[PDB]
Design a protein around this nucleic acid. Structure first.
Lengths: 107, 121, 118, 118, 118, 118, 121, 107
DNA sequence: AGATTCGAATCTAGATTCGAATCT
DNA sequence: AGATTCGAATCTAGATTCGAATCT
C-alpha cells in the first residue's frame, strides 16, 4: 500500500539527506519511499531478544547478590560454626574456583 | 514537499487505524498524509537519538559465571540449611535423600531438551 | 545471486516433495528455489557447526544445555532451602513466612514475569 | 535434474568460499553446483532428523520460556530466603545484615551489572 | 520487449478468463502476458485493416470474396457447357464423351488434386 | 489492474509508432500503456465477434480447399470441353485446331506463366 | 571437430528414427552423430543452392486477371452453347433459366464464407 | 534434446563461417548449435503456401488458355455465326475490357 | 559415442518498487 | 487528500541455450 504525505521542508530535507547518507554507506537500494517507510515503522514503535536478555541478566545478577548474602549468614549460623565445615575463608575461594573452571569450559 | 512511500500492509493498517482513532477523538482534520507526517517527524527524532550513541560472547560468559557461582553458593547454603536444628528435627531434609533427588530433578529437566537418545546433532 | 546445481533424482524428488508439502500447509509462496535456499542455509549451518566442533569450541547447544542444568539445579536447591528457612524458629516467630502464603506468591511472581515476554 | 535457487549474498559467499577451500585441498573437481548439491543433501538429512526427533527437536522459544520461569522463580524464592536469613538471630547479632542496607545494595549491584550490557 | 498497460477491471477479467479457458483446452502454456500479446497482435491487425479501409484499398477479404465468386461462377458455367458439349452430335459420334464416364472421371481428378494439399 | 505482456519487436514498434502518431494529432495524453489498453479493448471485441459468427468467422484453410476443388474441377471440365470442341466439324474445317498442336501450346503457356513467379 | 546442437523434439525423433532405419538396413555403424553429420552435409549443399539465386501483390493481380478473363470467356461460350441446335433440342438449356440458376449458385457459394449478415468485419 | 555430431573439418568450417556471416547480418543470436539445427532441419526436408500458389497459378493459366481456344471454336459454330452476336472482333476486346476493369477494382 | 556437469546467459512470467505527474 | 497512470527498474521463478569439458 502506498502513502502520500505532505510534509514540511524540514522533514523533507532530513529524509532526502538520509537517503544520501545511506547510498554513501554502500546501502545501494536506499530510496525516498524506502527510507520514509523505515522511519514510519520507527515512529509507530515509539517477545524481544534484547529486552529478554536484559531481564535475565538482572534476575541472575540479583540472585547472585542475594545468595552471596545468604551464604554469609548461613556461615554465621551456630550449627554451621559447629560442623567446622563451613569456614568462609575456605568455601568462598572454593566457590570462586568452581566458577572459574566452569567458565573456562566454554571460554 | 510530498513523499510517496510504499509500505507493507501492517504499517498501512496501523496508520489508517490511527486516522480513525483521531477523528473519533474530535481531531476533525486527521488524515492519512497528515498522520504519516506526524509519524515521520516522530521517527526522525528517535533515529537521531539512536544515531548519537551488543556483544553475545561477552554476555554468554558473564551469564555462565553468575549461574555457576549461584550454583556453587546454593550447594553450600543447602548443606548448611540441612545442618540447622529445625531441619534435623523435621526429619524431611536428609541430605542423602534430597541431594540425589535434586540431581534427579536436574537430569530430567535437561532431558526434556537434550534427550540423550537424540545426541550427535 | 542465483545458483544452478545439478543434483540427483533423489534430492530432486525430496525437494519438489517439500514444496508440495508446504503449499499444502498454506505456505502459498513455497517454491523450488525458495525451498532449496532454505535447505542450503540449513546445510551450511550444520557444516559450520560440524566444523566448529572438530576445531576448538564454542557450541550454542552444549552451552544451552549446561545453563539449563545449572538453572534447574539452582531452582530445586532453592525450593528446598526455602522450605527449611520457613522451618527456622525465627521465621515462624515473625509470622511473615508461612509457606501457605509465600509459596503461591512466588508462583504468582513467576507467572507474571513469564507473561511479560509470553 | 537441475535446480536454480536465488539465495542471499551471505549464503552465496559461504559457498563460493567452500569451492575455493576444496580446490585448495586437491579436490580438483570442486564446483559451485557440485558443492551446493552436497550441501543440499546435507540439509535434507538434518531436516529429516529434526522431523523425526520429538515435537521435532530442540525448541528455542519453549526453552527461553522455561529458563525465564526457573530464573524468575529462583529470584522470588531468594528474596524470601534473604528476608528470613536477616531474621535469624545470628544475623541480627552481627549487625552486618540490616535488610534495609543490603537490599538497596543488591538493587545497586543488579543495575550496574545490567548497565554493563544495556 | 515488455509492455506494461494499466487496463480497467473489465478488460482484465476478460483476459484472465481467456487464460483459464485456454489451459482448460490443453493449451498448457497459456499465460497472462502470453494471451495479451496474442490480443494485441489481433487488435493491431484490425486497426491496420480499418486504416487501410478508409484510405485507398487494398483488402484481402474483399478480394478473397471476388475470387470465390468468379471461380464459383466459372465452375457452374463450365458444368453447363460440358453438358451441352456432350450433347453435340460430333461428341456423341466419337463415343468418347459419355457423361456417365467423363463426369465421374472429373470428380476423381478433383479429389486427387485436392488431396495433394489436404 | 496492470498487465505485463512480452511482445515481439514488430508489435512493439507498431505501438510505439501509434503513440507517436497520436501526440502528433494533439492527443497529448497518448501513452504506451494508454494505447495498448485501447488495442486490447479492440482485440477483445473482435475475438468476441469471431466467437459468435458461425464455426467462428472466415476460415483460410476451408476456403483454400474449396477454391482448389473448384479450380481443379474447372480444369478437368475444360480439358474435356476442349477435346469436344476440337471434334466439332467447324473446327476440323478451319484447320486451326489440331488438338495435337493446341495441346502442347497450352502446356507451354502454363509453364511460362508459372515460371513468372516460381 | 565436434558440434553440440540443441534441437527440438521433432528433429530429434526424426534422426534417432533414421539411425534405427539404417542399422535395420545392415548399416551396422549407423549412429546419432554419424547420421546428423550426413544430414548437416546434406543441408549445407542445399542452403548454398538457395543462397545462389515471391511477390504477393503482383501474383494476386495476375490471378484476378486470369480469373476475370476466364469468367468473361465462359459467359460468352455459355451463350453460344445455348445457341447450339442440339442444346435447343434438349429443352434443358433455356438461358433464361440456366443463367439466373448460375447467379443463384454463385451467391450461395459466396455466402458460405461471406454471409451478408456477418459484414463490417 | 541435444545432439553431439563429430564432423570433418570441411563441414565445421562451413558452419562456423555461417555463424559469422549471420551475426554480420544483424542476426545477433546466431550460434553454432543454433545454425546446425537450422541446417539439420534443412537436410531432413530434402499443405504449403508456395507449392499451393504454384498449382493454382498453373490450373488457372491452363484454364485460361483452354477457354481462349474453346471461345474461338464456339465462334466458328454455324449457330453462332447465324446469330450475328458473336463476332470475335467484338467479343474479344469486350472480354479484354472486362478483365481490365475488374483488375482495376483492386489495382 | 553420447551421458552429463558446469556456469554464463537470455527469455517469458508476473510481483513489486519508485518517483514524476495529473486530477480528486 | 489521495486515486491513479506511467514507464524505468529489480527481483524471484524456472525453462531453455550454449559451448567448454570430462568420462562412456
Amino acid at each position: 500500500p502506498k502513502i502520500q504525505t505532505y510534509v514540511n521542508n524540514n522533514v523533507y530535507e532530513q529524509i532526502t539527506d538520509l537517503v544520501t547518507i545511506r547510498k554513501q554507506e554502500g546501502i545501494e537500494e536506499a530510496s525516498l519511499s524506502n527510507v520514509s517507510s523505515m522511519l514510519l515503522e520507527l515512529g509507530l514503535r515509539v517477545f524481544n531478544q534484547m529486552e529478554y536478555n536484559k531481564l535475565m541478566l538482572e534476575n541472575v545478577s540479583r540472585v547472585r547478590a542475594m545468595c552471596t548474602e545468604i551464604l554469609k549468614m548461613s556461615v554465621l549460623n551456630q550449627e554451621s560454626i559447629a560442623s567446622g565445615n563451613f569456614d568462609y575463608a575456605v568455601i568462598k575461594p572454593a566457590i570462586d574456583k568452581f566458577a572459574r573452571e566452569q567458565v573456562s569450559i566454554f571460554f
